[PDB]
Structure formats: structure tokens, C-alpha cells
Paper text:
To find the acetyl-CoA binding site of EcMaeB, we collected cryo-EM data of EcMaeBholo in the presence of acetyl-CoA (EcMaeBacetyl-CoA) and determined its structure at 2.03 Å resolution. This structure reveals that EcMaeBacetyl-CoA forms the V state as does EcMaeBholo. Acetyl-CoA molecules were located outside the apex of a triangle formed by the PTA domains. As a result, acetyl-CoA binds to the positively charged surface outside the PTA domain in EcMaeB. At the acetyl-CoA binding site of EcMaeB, the thioacetyl group of acetyl-CoA is inserted into the space created by the α4 and α5 helices and the loop region (V499–R506). Acetyl-CoA binds to EcMaeB mainly through interactions with three amino acids: R475, R482, and Y510. R475 forms a hydrogen bond with one of the carbonyl O atoms of the pantothenic acid moiety in acetyl-CoA. R482 forms a hydrogen bond with one of the phosphate groups of acetyl-CoA. The methyl group of the acetyl tail in acetyl-CoA shows a CH-π interaction with Y510. The α4 helix shifts to approach acetyl-CoA by 1.5 Å and the α5 helix moves away from acetyl-CoA by 1.4 Å.
While reducing NAD(P)+ to NAD(P)H, MEs catalyze the oxidative decarboxylation of the TCA cycle intermediate L-malate to produce the TCA carbon source pyruvate and a byproduct carbon dioxide (CO2) in the presence of divalent metal ions such as a magnesium (Mg2+) ion. The hybrid-type MEs consist of an N-terminal catalytic domain (ME domain) and a C-terminal activity regulating domain. The PTA domain does not possess an enzymatic activity of PTA but acts as an allosteric modulator of catalysis; that is, binding of some metabolites to the PTA domain increases or decreases the enzymatic activity. Binding of acetyl-CoA to the PTA domain is known to reduce the catalytic activity of several hybrid-type MEs.
Numbering used by the authors:
A (entry chain A), B (entry chain A): 2 to 759
C (entry chain A): 507 to 557
Amino acid sequence: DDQLKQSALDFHEFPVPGKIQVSPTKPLATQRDLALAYSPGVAAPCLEIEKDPLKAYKYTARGNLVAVISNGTAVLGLGNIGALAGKPVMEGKGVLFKKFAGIDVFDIEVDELDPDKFIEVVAALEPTFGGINLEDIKAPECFYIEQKLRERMNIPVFHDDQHGTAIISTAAILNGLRVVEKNISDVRMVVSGAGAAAIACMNLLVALGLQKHNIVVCDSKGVIYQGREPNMAETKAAYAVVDDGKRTLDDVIEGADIFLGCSGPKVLTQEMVKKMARAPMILALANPEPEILPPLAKEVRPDAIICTGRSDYPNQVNNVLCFPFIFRGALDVGATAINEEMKLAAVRAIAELAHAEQSEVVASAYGDQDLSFGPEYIIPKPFDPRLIVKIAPAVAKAAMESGVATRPIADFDVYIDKLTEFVYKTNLFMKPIFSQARKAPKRVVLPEGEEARVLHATQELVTLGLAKPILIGRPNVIEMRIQKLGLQIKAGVDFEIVNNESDPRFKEYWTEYFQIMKRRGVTQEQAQRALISNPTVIGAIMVQRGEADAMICGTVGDYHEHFSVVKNVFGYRDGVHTAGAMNALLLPSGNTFIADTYVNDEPDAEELAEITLMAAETVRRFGIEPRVALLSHSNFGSSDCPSSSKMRQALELVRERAPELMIDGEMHGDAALVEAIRNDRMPDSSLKGSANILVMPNMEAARISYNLLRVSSSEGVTVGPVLMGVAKPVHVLTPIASVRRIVNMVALAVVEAQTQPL
Amino acid sequence: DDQLKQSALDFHEFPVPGKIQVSPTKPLATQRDLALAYSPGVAAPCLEIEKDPLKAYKYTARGNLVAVISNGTAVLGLGNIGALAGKPVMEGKGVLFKKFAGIDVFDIEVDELDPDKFIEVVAALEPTFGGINLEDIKAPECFYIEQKLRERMNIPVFHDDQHGTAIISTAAILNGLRVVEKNISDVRMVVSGAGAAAIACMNLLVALGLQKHNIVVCDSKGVIYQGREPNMAETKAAYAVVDDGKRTLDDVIEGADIFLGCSGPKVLTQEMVKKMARAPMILALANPEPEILPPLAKEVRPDAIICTGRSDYPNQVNNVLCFPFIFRGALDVGATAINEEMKLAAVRAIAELAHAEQSEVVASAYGDQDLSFGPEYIIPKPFDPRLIVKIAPAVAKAAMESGVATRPIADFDVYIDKLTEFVYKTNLFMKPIFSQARKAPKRVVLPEGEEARVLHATQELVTLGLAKPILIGRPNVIEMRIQKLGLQIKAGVDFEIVNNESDPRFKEYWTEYFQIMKRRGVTQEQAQRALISNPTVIGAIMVQRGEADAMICGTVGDYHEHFSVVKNVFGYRDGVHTAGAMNALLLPSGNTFIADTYVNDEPDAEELAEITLMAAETVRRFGIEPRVALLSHSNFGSSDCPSSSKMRQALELVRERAPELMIDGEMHGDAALVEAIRNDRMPDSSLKGSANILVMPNMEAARISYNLLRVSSSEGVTVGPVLMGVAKPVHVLTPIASVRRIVNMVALAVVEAQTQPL
Amino acid sequence: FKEYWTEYFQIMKRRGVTQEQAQRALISNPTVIGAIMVQRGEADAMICGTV
Ligand SMILES: CC(=O)SCCNC(=O)CCNC(=O)[C@H](O)C(C)(C)COP(=O)(O)OP(=O)(O)OC[C@H]1O[C@@H](n2cnc3c(N)ncnc32)[C@H](O)[C@@H]1OP(=O)(O)O
Ligand SMILES: CC(=O)SCCNC(=O)CCNC(=O)[C@H](O)C(C)(C)COP(=O)(O)OP(=O)(O)OC[C@H]1O[C@@H](n2cnc3c(N)ncnc32)[C@H](O)[C@@H]1OP(=O)(O)O
Ligand SMILES: NC(=O)c1ccc[n+]([C@@H]2O[C@H](COP(=O)([O-])OP(=O)(O)OC[C@H]3O[C@@H](n4cnc5c(N)ncnc54)[C@H](OP(=O)(O)O)[C@@H]3O)[C@@H](O)[C@H]2O)c1
Ligand SMILES: NC(=O)c1ccc[n+]([C@@H]2O[C@H](COP(=O)([O-])OP(=O)(O)OC[C@H]3O[C@@H](n4cnc5c(N)ncnc54)[C@H](OP(=O)(O)O)[C@@H]3O)[C@@H](O)[C@H]2O)c1
Ligand SMILES: [Mg+2]
Ligand SMILES: [Mg+2]
């Protein structure tokens, strides 16, 4: 716990406190715009809203924000710690809101511990938000707040902690009945636990068609029957059962077709599973520890379908399936609330998507797709790119038929086109790489073993279990620096040290290097010096001999001093005559790759075509459809310099060698990234949307552009420089490489080594 | 009004509604970070705040936001129109907050029309904000709200609409007494008007040292004396005077040393000024129309000092002097409120800055500096870059001595260094250009007169009075397109049309062109064709003949087809042998210029040195200190390609020819923009901070980098491409030029033509 | 070691040698060590090149 505690504490404490910030979306540097954006001109918009209140959407940005409001009464599993102490959780919830759907979130921690004032303040804050996600609140005051607001608010009010997880649970049950081959009106549902995210689920399931008399509710006290306490509170009498001696979970665990558990860990015992019914449908939503372990249920009864809230098992009940996309559906039409119709229109799109998987470009073999509608796959993945095109139009149509939509949409196809254009610019492709690497770690040698960044990265890799590292350097220096940095990695146990000043394999290593380079200017004495003073050579020989599977080098020195060694020892991949390096950037238009940043100073047309094909294949392996643009200062033949002609010839060669690849050129960068400019210049261009692969005419342009964009349009680091064309898994980094970049590159190298490391 | 109404309505209605947006400041695309940013890891930060509540500043971003809260009871001069209808004004106020100081603003329009619930909701919203700027609220409920909050809030509460303008008024009076040579305890102050931004000013002036019995208050009723109404409300009895027959403004206008007017236009008459005292000190803060016209006061009495709230006169009382910087001072220390000490510590820094002007790099002769402490200059300019270094440390020191500061600062010099680093990246240099151009418009010919963008720009230029335009094209097409676009410009009155198909000056024009180009491959017949089919040639001959002062061309066609004409007709400036083009970008590090984007395909070392010197001089004329970086894929001699050696030679030449210029190289782009990387590589580099001029080795790198940065790191448009080295004021644009870019370039050309157009 | 590699870096900082590269050179390149020794006056001459 201490290591994880320190990692989380330092996750955002040192560089900048917090996890979100407020940023403007429009520019302001001039005069005569203040005369219009302020008092002299701002009077005209105001008088329009006064005459037409409905015109507040054209001249303002009112309806796009959501409030995440808490009081800190039940902070995760920590309980009542206060509203202020719960700010990090609310901030992280807003982060998840923004990262998965693109929802602006204001996180508020009201200090009120009384309900009445809670509704007072939330109703006062009405004009600020288009929807209020109540979070970290006890019961049953939340229901009262939501009902009073919805009957007093002309704007959407949606407690997500109830209704969103209700939707996710309901969709996992409607599709589960298909697999178990049972009817909704004949199944028996048993629930052990009452709380905030249980009553909404029960209401949704009852409105789905399930009989109320077939539902049994419980808590820590036992079966919630009639005649248990003199003062038995509400939200428990509408679902209570008559007293027939039933008092515990096991009394109703027999014959239960569905078991929706949302309270308490370690509740279901092996005997209860043994005495359960056939084809169990267990929904153990408990996050810190589920009600029943999915490995434990599938052992005693292999016919059980388990839909947990954890990230370690499939069919994950994560609210990131609910609060991003359900709120996005509610907002995009401008509702007045999510009634049962919208709650069902959203629950049916999720279920339809879960049983209509059709591949459509995935991360090659990187990871584990296994997308087949069955027991192990009942709901869409937490960050499915398609869950904005299926939910938002569905909710908009439901609102149009329900009378709560204020501004109807006429042409839906344009709407889906706009939403898919929006979702094309988000792709978290490093998670499957990390998962695949964790599935089977490989041996990776790091020649710069004395570097502080490399030691930090080695600690992280050992903690995550991504690879088995081998460090080259002086043992005394490495141990002293590990102690100075306060790391927990130990030589020999966590990682292996190769002493470059002394090793029993010195003779074999330098003899092999001499045999490689004897007719390339290297004498035996020079080989002996190289196997002592050049760790890259040691690592390359190690890889070639099969004592390691991959190598990450280049954090010290110049790129070509490592690349020359790599090329000499490994050589090119079969059928390849050139190599290139690709760097990745996250721009507003999406993930963007820049090709040949480090290898070739001035490639010719054939080299450019080979680089383009390799880059397209590599990007395809990430799960991204390649869209290539050949860049030049000439815009579609406007210049006749030899560089532009070379780009045109490379385009012809690429078209000859790969007719299925999306590519155009030669063109300017803005035309490559902005579709409107390109459509103005070349209406019938084969390149659609924004290009994600930019191939440059020469080294200097590529490197200068990449450096300026990296320091200017900085939105995180994924991979780079990615080396292509070499016959072994190896990448050369740069001295400015960060710890996260090193870890990512090691994971990518492990994944490459797993599949025939050639 | 209709034209301004349409301009303001379309200012932000068509492209995107609204004027602000919410943007994150940290990246999120990976896994294993959700395990730390959320539930599994987010528990560790929460338990730390529970044990230590003061630790909420290290693990959260709590204290940086301000609420701008209104109820729409007095919207500017429109009165009571509602809270929702006042959203554009609040949004614009937040825009001004962010643009001048960098303050995050949440704009709220509460529908409550009752005070008690207003304090209820604002006190409920305490944990969201570090300060509440009450706006658009009547009196005296605001005082009650502020007092109750400050006595119930442990966080800063600062009604800016009272106290900030009180500070600005007080600073304009303390410095005014120096000019008028009078004592604060012996002056007579007369006020005609009671309102929100008058009682705070009176309180501040009384605490400054002025006697209460020397202050006279008035309203529409008249003198606020005792015994006027049976129920005379508060905030008027603490300053009322005894009844001696004084009932109107003129009864107390005699002998008044200071006249602070903040209510009503057209209040002071000529006779009142005639019967006033010597050295009048008039503060007419009325925004829509001042109490007395500054031109009217200075005529009857030339000894009067007037400090108005308008932008048409000096000594402007604009809250952009108050709410950005005073709130910044309050926030940067983490106060508990702005008491009199902070209110005075901020008012003394403003006064000290107003009478301690020392130039320190201004916009050359572009505009009107005239910074001399006198009657016409009593307060710092509304967007003075230095008003964050003088106010924030002053307020922090005042808080440290007052016991309201929670986290004291030890080393102040580091603090001022950080603040000046922050303020170095903001410079609104186009406003002085626009002002200087408006002072003396010039004749500017636009060869592409039939373009829709050019017609829109011509309409804007005529409206702003920046230049006298001359359009070249077919009159029928121009009139038909003007009618189709619905513009109000009329040929012959607003602008002059030159018909390229018929003009009585055809023979002289083509004869002059032939005389220029007879030994450069142009026959007489070719000259006759050129003076019909090439509008750029017509415009260039017009400029050379003195029938126009400048030309803006290039919105259609290729850059070099216009540049060749310009070079042939005009030639180089005396003492210059090469030309270059500079493009401007607004990056996170500040205004950034990229040199030689369009002229020279591959300049040599001497050409690069000349380009660098011209770019440095041009940037200096904008009011920006030039800091040049020579860019290459080689980092301080790491490569030996001819391009890197050329950059090194150019560096040596530049150092020889300009020893006073800040410059270094050759280096990578990231080292040029990020000081930490450069300090790591070259500790003793002469380049300090972030470079704002990037000189590129060849055309392709410059253009590709500029295009990618413009479409990716887009933060508005200022100028570009700026042509340097030509012997006449002319600029060649590109086909992708926007209307705003054309207007800006025309203004720059006018300013260049005003000063010896060579 | 520190004085030697610092002097070498001061000589070669604008010739493609970083501080880390200078530190590596003052360990793996005896010719550089001898040349710095001679330039510092701790030796009068150097004979190198047998390898
Ligand atoms: C994975 C890697 O390889 S990382 C790189 C590791 N780097 C190193 O190990 C470098 C350190 N080692 C070295 O530099 C060399 O092994 C040396 C110079 C010390 C010795 O190698 P060489 O002198 O060229 O020859 P050789 O391989 O025969 O070894 C000589 C050794 O045998 C000993 N020896 C002496 N006479 C004899 C003999 N007749 N027969 C065998 N050994 C003998 C020597 O004393 C010497 O001992 P030592 O090296 O343990 O001190
Ligand atoms: C600012 C600018 O200049 S924008 C560019 C404007 N462009 C133009 O004006 C192009 C339109 N004009 C033209 O192309 C030419 O003036 C032309 C071709 C029409 C005529 O010019 P030319 O034939 O070369 O010769 P010249 O200058 O002597 O003019 C001939 C005219 O004189 C007339 N003329 C005939 N005999 C004689 C004579 N003995 N003496 C004088 N004029 C005569 C012709 O009928 C003709 O009349 P018109 O041009 O009004 O119809
Ligand atoms: N979608 C999700 O991921 C999700 C959503 C909600 C909850 N959860 C998880 O579910 C658990 C409880 O959440 P909650 O909203 O129900 O909070 P809660 O109501 O505060 O706590 C669970 C409640 O269930 C009862 N309970 C406790 N232990 C029990 C046990 N062993 N057997 C039966 N009943 C027991 C108690 O009710 P009484 O005190 O009234 O007897 C207790 O108050 C937590 O682990 C939480 O993380 C997950
Ligand atoms: N810093 C600034 O730029 C700034 C700040 C504040 C105000 N102003 C300007 O000052 C004016 C008034 O603002 P305010 O806050 O005072 O609003 P206000 O109180 O709502 O309106 C002005 C008040 O002054 C009185 N008044 C009106 N006309 C008058 C006249 N001709 N002579 C004397 N008194 C008159 C009336 O008070 P009774 O109805 O009680 O008699 C009236 O209610 C507006 O033009 C406003 O824009 C500028
Ligand atoms: Mg929660
Ligand atoms: Mg105001």
C-alpha cells in the first residue's frame, strides 16, 4: 500500500497541484473587439434574449456544463471524512467525465449537512448548469432533491450516481437474459443490499417488466420484511415482503435467476452458490471488493454470468460506461430530465451495441479483442469509441417523441456524421499495449543503467510487471544512486546487472563483435575496447545471442552513434532496404505521427515510399486507420523544385505498391490537417478528414516541426521515436526522453518481441 | 447603431455561440493513471486533507477561481431586463478578467430577486471560489451580503464593483493632489450621485484622510440633507449634511477642489464650471456618457484634470485597471478579504507606478506614448504589463503584516521573477498600430477588388476609418457582389474603383512599365497586356507614381508572381540586398515570429544575417524585445551538415554586425522555446527565457512548421506575412488570408507609409 | 575527474559534446585524458596512437 500511496500522492502533487484547470476556447488580443464583446456592443445580444428568451443558445454558451456536487458523507470506502477532504475524488470524477465523452464539469463540495438547505443551494445554482450529477451523498435525501428539482427545473436534472449505473445494470440484464434463455417476466431476482445505486436499478428493472413480488431486498440487518422495526424508513417498504420466516440471504438464494448485489464484500458463500439455480446471473457491483469473486463463482458453477464493477474482469460495471455517455445523450438534445423513455432509449442502444459487434479496425493482435457476444462479453467496453453515435441520437429521438426536446434536429445523418467526426480524434491505444505486455513479459536490456531516469523507469516497470530488465553499468554507482533516489529495486532479484568493467562473457562477446566488423575497420583490440566502453554494443550482442529479447537505448549521446551499431549488428528486416523513425503527437485533430525524424537526412522517392508503407503498417497495428499526407512547401504542383517532384514520384510509387491506402499530396500542412482548406483547393482529393501520418521531404523540416509542435501543442506523450525496418526489436531514444516515454517504449518493445522478434 | 448592432450580434453568434469555454490543463490518455487519479489511488490524497486541512493546496487546485454573480437588475444602461438576459455581459466581464490578469471566472446569473436568499446561495457556494465579484446588483443589499460573508467566510470575499473602482478612483485622487498642489485634509469634495460604486469610493477617501464634513452627496432628488423625506434610507444618512438651504449641485459647486461624479450624464453646466474653484479635480466616471465632457471642461477652464471612464480620453477609469489586478493581488497571497490595508497597499502601488514611468521598451513611434506624469497622465494604462509585479507582491506583503496570509513567502525576488516571467508572454501590440493608423489614414490600393474577403475588409476599414481604399476590378462585378453580400459601401464615396478594362491613364501606366522592363524581356505589346490583365502591376505603378501610399496584394495566386512585380518596380531599400517574409504566431510561450517563410528558397549565411537583422528591427518596432534563435536539426555543433555550418557562420556575422542583440544557436526548437532544456545543454547561453524570433535554414522547414503550428497551436491572428527589405510599403498575402488578417495588414501598411514611405 | 571533464566540456561544448558525453570521454578515451593533462601543464608531451 505504501508504494501505491506514494505514487498516488505524487501523481499530482509535485509538478502542479490538482487534476483539472480552466482554459478559454477563443482568442483575445486586439482592440475594437472589446467594443463589441463588452458594454458598447454587448448590449445588442442582451436585448435579443429579453425579447426572445429561447435565443440564449445562439449568443451564449449556456448549455454544455455539468455540476458534480458532493458533501463528503461517504467518500468511496472511507466513509464520512468531510466535504473538503473529498475534493480529489470529485476532481477525478470530472476528469473521467471530460476524458470519455467531453463534458465540462464543475466540482462543488458544499459544506451543508442538512437536506433542506441542500435543495435550496442546488436549486439556486440552476442557471449555471444543464444537469447536476449528485455524488457521494447518503439516502434518501437524494431522491427528494431530484424529485423537487425536476418538478421545479425547466432544465435537465440527472442524478447519475443512481440512474446511470441503473442503466448500465439494466443493459447487462436485458442482454444477459438472451444468453441464459429466460423471460423478463418469469425470472426471480434477489438483492442483498440497499443504498443509493440500488433503488434506481430496482425502479428501472420494475419498469422493464419484472414483477415486484419476485424481487427480494436485504441489508446488513437481513431480509427487509414487514414487522421488523417500530420505525422502518422509506425506500424499503415499497419493496418489502411479508414475514414467512425468511431472514437471511440464503433463505432466498434458492431459485434466484438474477442476483443484483451492490453492497458489502464477502457476502456469498460456496454453499449458497451450490444451492442456487441454473444459469446464474450475478451482478456484483461492489467496487473495492465484489460480493462474489468472478474466478470463485465460475469454478463452483461454470454456467454463471458475472458482471462486476472491477477492471480486472470482463463485463465491467464502470460508471465511465454511464456518466460520460448517458449524460452526453441527455445534454446533446437539451432535455428537461432523463425520464424512463430516455433511460430506456439509452439502455437499449448499449444492449444493441453489445450484441452487434462487427470488428471495424482494432489494435491488430495487440491485446485481446475476443469481441464475441457471449457469457464473457455482455456490455460494450468502458471506452468504446462508438458509444456516442448510438446513444446521443437515440436519446435525441426519444426526446423528440416525448415533448421534452426544445430544438428539434431535422437531418439525423448529418448529426451522426458530426458526432463520428468528433469521436475520430480520440484513441487510447497504449492501454492494449500495456495489457499485452503484462500478459507475457520479455527480457529487455537497458545500456544506460546508471541514469536516474532509467532507474525510475526500471522501478515502474518492475512494479507494473511489464518486463524483466537487464541493466548495464558499474554496480557501485547503480546501487549508490538507487539508495540516493530511495528506490526499492534490488539487484539480482528485481533486475540483473551486467558489469561492463568485468564479466565472464567478455571474450565471447568481443570475438563475436570482431567477427561481425573485421572487414569494416575494426581490429581485435578495437573490438575489446568497444565491448568495455560502448554499452550499446554490449546490449546489441546480447540481443543477437538470444540472452535478451529487446533493447531500449539512446538516453545519452547522439542518435546515429547508437543507430550505426544497431544497423551493423542486426541489419535490415528481410525484404527491406531502408529504415526510418516515427514520432507521435496528440494534436487537436487527434493522434498525429511524423515520419523519418531521425534516420535519413535526404531520402529519395523510393526511400520515401518504403518509409510511408512501414509507417502505415505500424499505425495500423496500433488500431488507427492510416491517412497519409505528403507534405511540401508546394501545394499540388504549385512549385517545381526537385523536392516537390520527389514527393510526387513517391506518391506514384506508394499508389502502385498499396492501392488500398488513403494518401494524397503533395500539399501544405494546413491542407493536410484542415479538411475545409483541402476541399477548397482540391475538391476530389482521396484524402478524407484529417491526416494522421505526415511524411516530410527532409530531416530538418521533420525534426524542427516535431520539436516546435511538441513544446507548443503539448498534450501528453505516447510513443517515439519508433524505429522501423530493423531486424530486431530495438528503439533509440533521445537525451530529452522522460521516464514515462521510456516506460512506454519498453512496453512497445516487449509487445514487438512477443511476436517473432525479428 | 444598426451597423454596430449587427457587428456585435455577429461578433460571436455565427461561428460558435458564447465567448468563453472550459478547457483542461493536464493530459489524460493512458491506463494505470486512472488507478491513481481515481478510486484505487485517489484515496491517499483524501486521507491527507482529513488529517491536515491546510494540505488542500498541494494536492488540489482549489484557490484560483472567481465568481462573477449577477441577478440582472441593472444591466449597464438597460436597467432591469432579467438575470438570464444579462449572461453576455457577465461572460464579457469574465473575458476581461482572463485577458488582463489571467483569472478563471465562473459567470452565474441567479434568478433570486430577494436579498436573504442571495446571501444564502452565495454563502452556500463558498467552497467553489476564492473570491466573489458581485456585479449588476442594486443597493444596499450588496453591502449586507459582503459584510455577512466576510464575517462568516474564512476565504477572501471581494465585491469588485465597489472596491476595485474605489481603488482606481482613490489612486487617481492621491496622484491628482500632487499635480494640483493641495493637501488631502484641506480639500473640498462634492459628489452628485449615489450608487453601488460611490459608497466604497467615499469610504476609501474618508480612510485616506479626508474629513467627512467636507464631503457633499447628491442624487436626482438633490442635496442629501437631513429632513427631506419621512423614510430616508441608509447609505445616505452617514454622509448627509444639515439643512442650510442647499438643495442643488450648483449650491455646493463653489469652492469644490475635487468633484467625484459617478451618476447621470449631462449634469454639469458651463456656468457651474465658471463658478468652480481653481485647479479643478473632476472624476466623471459615467461610462455611457460622462458627467462632463473632457473636451468641454478643458475649454472653459484649462486647469481642470478630468479622469473619466471612457476609452476616448486619457486617465481612463476602466475597471480593467481594477478587477484583473486588484483581484490578482488579493488571490496571489490567499487573503481572507481586502480590508483597508490591502485596499491601500494596492492603491499606493498604482499611484507609485503612475508617477514613476521609465519607458523600458515601447512600441517605437507606433502610436502615442507621451508617458509623462502630468495632467494628461495620472494613472497607468489599462493593460500596462507591469501592473502584476507592483500589486501582487505589495498585497502579499500587506497580508503578511496583517495576519490574513495563510502561506507566507520567504524570498520575494524569486516571486517577482516568476510574475515577470508570466507577464512576458502577453503583449497586445496591434492596438497602438490601429490607433496610429486612425490618426492619419493613407491611400491603400487593393488589386483583388472583386474578392468577397476584400470587400468585407474594405467595409470594416471604412467603418473604422483606418485607410482610404482604392479597388481595382470590373465595376459591374464589384457592385453586384457588394449588393449580394449586403454591404453599405458605395463606389466613389466610401472607396474609389479603378476599372482595369478602361481608364484614361492606360497609356502613361503601360509606358512607365515598359520603361522599367524594356531590357527585362517585356515588349510594348506585353506591357499593354500586363496593364490590363495584372492588377498587381497596376497597383505597383500607382504606388510608384504617388497616386497611392501602399498596396496589399496576394489574396489570389502564388506569392512569387506578386513578389517579382514588387521587386522589379520598387527594388530594394537603400543599403539592402535581400528580402524576407515574417509570419507571427501566438504560442503558450508568447508572441512568436518565424522568419523567411516565403522569399528565399535557400539563403546563404550573409542573406540569413540580413534577414535576422531586419526581423529584429521589425519586432523592435512592435514594442517587443527581440530574442533570436537560429534553428537546426543540429544542437550546438552535434552535426556537420552544410546547413548547420551555414547557421553557425550566420551567427558569427550577426554577432559582428549587432553586438547588442540577444541571439544564440544553432539549436533545436525545444531548446529555443524551453529554458530548462537549453540550460541543461548550454548553461552559459546568452539567450535568456524563450526566444520570440525563429530563423529557419530553408524555405520548406519554415513554411511546414508555420502551417502546422498555425492550424494546431492556434490562438488568433495578428500579422503576416510581413515583407521586409523592399523600398515601398507593400505586403503580399496568401489565398488563405482571412478578413481580419487583411484588415490588420492594411493597418500595418498605413502605419509604415506614415513614416517616409520608403 | 571533475576538473578534467569540465575543462574538456568547456573546450567542446559548441562542438557537439554534452556534459555527459564529456564525462564518458574522460573515462573511455585515454588520448583525451593525456591531451587535457598536457594542456593543464601536468605533462610536457604525449606519445599516442599505438592502438
Ligand atoms: C557481457 C560483457 O562481456 S560486458 C563487458 C565486460 N568487460 C570485461 O570483463 C573487461 C575486463 N576484462 C578484461 O579487460 C580482460 O579479460 C583482461 C585484459 C583483464 C584479460 O584478458 P586478456 O589479458 O586479454 O586475456 P585472457 O582472456 O587470456 O585472460 C587473461 C587472464 O588469465 C591470466 N593468465 C595468465 N597466464 C595465463 C595462462 N597461461 N593461461 C590462462 N590464463 C592466464 C591473467 O592473469 C589474466 O587474469 P585476470 O584477467 O583474471 O586478471
Ligand atoms: C490605371 C489604368 O490604366 S488601369 C488599366 C486600364 N485599361 C484600359 O484602359 C484598357 C482599355 N484601352 C485599351 O486597350 C486601348 O486604349 C485601346 C486598344 C482601346 C486603344 O489604344 P490604342 O488603339 O493602342 O491607341 P490610342 O492610345 O491612340 O487610342 C486609340 C483611340 O483613338 C481613336 N483614334 C482613331 N484615330 C485616331 C487619331 N488619328 N488620333 C487619335 N485617336 C485616334 C481610336 O478610335 C481609339 O478610340 P477608343 O480607344 O476610345 O475606342
Ligand atoms: N457501480 C458501482 O461500481 C457501485 C455503485 C454503488 C456501490 N458500489 C459498491 O457497493 C458497496 C456498497 O455501496 P452502497 O451504495 O450500497 O453504500 P452503503 O449503502 O453506504 O453501504 C452498503 C450498505 O449495505 C449494507 N451492507 C453492508 N455490508 C453488508 C453485507 N456484508 N451484506 C449485506 N448488506 C451489507 C448496509 O446497509 P444498512 O447499514 O442499512 O444495513 C450498508 O449501509 C461498496 O463496496 C461500493 O463501492 C459500487
Ligand atoms: N467605473 C465606472 O465606469 C462606473 C462605475 C459606476 C457607474 N458608472 C456610471 O455611472 C452612471 C450611474 O451609475 P450608478 O452605479 O450610480 O447607477 P444608479 O445608481 O442605478 O443610477 C444613477 C443614480 O444616480 C442618480 N441620478 C440619475 N441621474 C442623475 C443626474 N442627472 N444627476 C444626479 N443624479 C442622478 C439617481 O439616484 P436616485 O434614483 O436615488 O435619485 C440614479 O438612481 C452610469 O452612467 C454608469 O455607467 C460608471
Ligand atoms: Mg461515487
Ligand atoms: Mg458592472
